[PDB]
Amino acid sequence: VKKFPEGFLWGVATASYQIEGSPLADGAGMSIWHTFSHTPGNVKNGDTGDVACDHYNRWKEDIEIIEKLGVKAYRFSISWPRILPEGTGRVNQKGLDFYNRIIDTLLEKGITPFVTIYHWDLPFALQLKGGWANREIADWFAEYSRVLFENFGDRVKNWITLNEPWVVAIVGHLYGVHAPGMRDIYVAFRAVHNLLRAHARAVKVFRETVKDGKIGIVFNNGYFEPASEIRAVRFMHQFNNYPLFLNPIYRGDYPELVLEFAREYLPENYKDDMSEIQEKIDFVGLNYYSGHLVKFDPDAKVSFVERDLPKTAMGWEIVPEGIYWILKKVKEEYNPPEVYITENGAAFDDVVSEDGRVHDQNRIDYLKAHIGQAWKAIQEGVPLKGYFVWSLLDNFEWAEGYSKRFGIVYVDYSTQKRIVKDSGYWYSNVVKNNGLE
Numbered sequence: 001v002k003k004f005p006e007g008f009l010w011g012v013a014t015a016s017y018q019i020e021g022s023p024l025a026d027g028a029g030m031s032i033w034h035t036f037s038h039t040p041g042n043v044k045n046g047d048t049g050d051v052a053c054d055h056y057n058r059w060k061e062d063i064e065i066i067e068k069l070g071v072k073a074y075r076f077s078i079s080w081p082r083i084l085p086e087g088t089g090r091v092n093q094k095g096l097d098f099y100n101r102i103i104d105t106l107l108e109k110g111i112t113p114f115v116t117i118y119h120w121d122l123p124f125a126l127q128l129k130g131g132w133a134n135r136e137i138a139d140w141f142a143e144y145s146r147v148l149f150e151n152f153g154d155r156v157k158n159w160i161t162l163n164e165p166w167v168v169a170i171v172g173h174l175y176g177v178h179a180p181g182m183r184d185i186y187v188a189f190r191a192v193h194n195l196l197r198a199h200a201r202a203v204k205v206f207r208e209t210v211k212d213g214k215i216g217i218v219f220n221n222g223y224f225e226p227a228s229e230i231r232a233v234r235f236m237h238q239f240n241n242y243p244l245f246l247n248p249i250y251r252g253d254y255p256e257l258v259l260e261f262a263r264e265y266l267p268e269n270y271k272d273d274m275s276e277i278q279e280k281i282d283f284v285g286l287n288y289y290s291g292h293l294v295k296f297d298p299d300a301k302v303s304f305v306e307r308d309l310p311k312t313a314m315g316w317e318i319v320p321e322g323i324y325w326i327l328k329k330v331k332e333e334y335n336p337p338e339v340y341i342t343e344n345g346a347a348f349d350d351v352v353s354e355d356g357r358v359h360d361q362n363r364i365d366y367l368k369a370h371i372g373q374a375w376k377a378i379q380e381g382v383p384l385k386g387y388f389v390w391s392l393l394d395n396f397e398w399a400e401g402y403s404k405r406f407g408i409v410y411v412d413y414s415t416q417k418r419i420v421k422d423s424g425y426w427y428s429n430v431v432k433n434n435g436l437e
């Protein structure tokens, strides 16, 4: 058997815009994902978050699912524009009430809330003022965070400032594939820098307001392997994985190969902000899904190489040893005091069988493999305190819309019916037993 430490936090994870629907209910402001997805051509099939999983109405049912599965922690995010419709200034009590009910319910049922302050749904009103490109977002984000800490910090004790700031900056502002949909490398690296300053201001305010909580930050990571016998792999790790942010946080500067590629794109006096950026954090969250074969390519000087490996419906190569590697590597490089896997999961082409069940053996296999490797990392000293499946529910998968299903619970969008998939029942057994067998 592979049993985990006493008190290990088994969780499931979601995000506000992906599950809630009702983006403009109860005085909420528009977010950039509202305006981006209502822009023709941005999202597959013209899909939007208007209805999504209707979690905005079905939240109690969904939490009852969490309880019934015996899952111990729920990672969810707060929609900034529900709380502050213009991004700063006015506070919307109805937005606060929505998350208060979720929080109180989880607590009553013995489930631990992990709150992501920002999972990509910036208020539109702030995007009009430049969003992440504007240095003033360090102030806006701090004010927003302060509101959350004051309203919920009595009950919520585990906080995440940002989900995947690399995606926010580069996919949102260089690739143009995510909101706000821009393609400017100088904007993208100012967003990188402002994301750090906003993260650090929010941590600073947390210490002033929530004397008992813990706060961290979440990064996306790939497992990069070199196509032959390498510096391309070094670059991809430092740019795409946690070092882009952790080197500022822990060491007070950007990683070396990031500066080689990107110094001209960062503000001229960016080092002036570094001492503030070093604000102490309590934990690192690592999201992990996939591995990549990578080669130097003269025509950022890196390309991916396709491998005959099992892939998910995203076309993402299934490489379980990556989650062990990234956990080892984070301890080796920065030694944070606590680590969580804040997302791990897979998209498969799920179908409800004639028996009324979703036989997602492919997802069970994927989860089991990765859980096994995280177990390994714990045996060799990585302080992993928890593991979160992405996702509780099939949901709006950003620019893929509803076409990608990541849930351990199937959602029939025509009726909003939830069907627990075999993987969800499987996971529940894992949580009950506190590990694999």
Ligand SMILES: OC[C@@H]1[C@@H](O)[C@H](O)[C@@H](O)c2nc(CNc3ccccc3)cn21
Residues within 6 Å of the ligand: 015, 018, 163, 164, 167, 171, 220, 221, 287, 289, 343, 390, 397, 398, 406
């Ligand atoms: O793609 C699945 C999930 C997504 O629904 C979450 O909102 C997000 O936190 C998330 N991040 C990754 C891994 N990195 C990534 C790759 C391509 C596009 C965006 C993020 C996967 N996921």
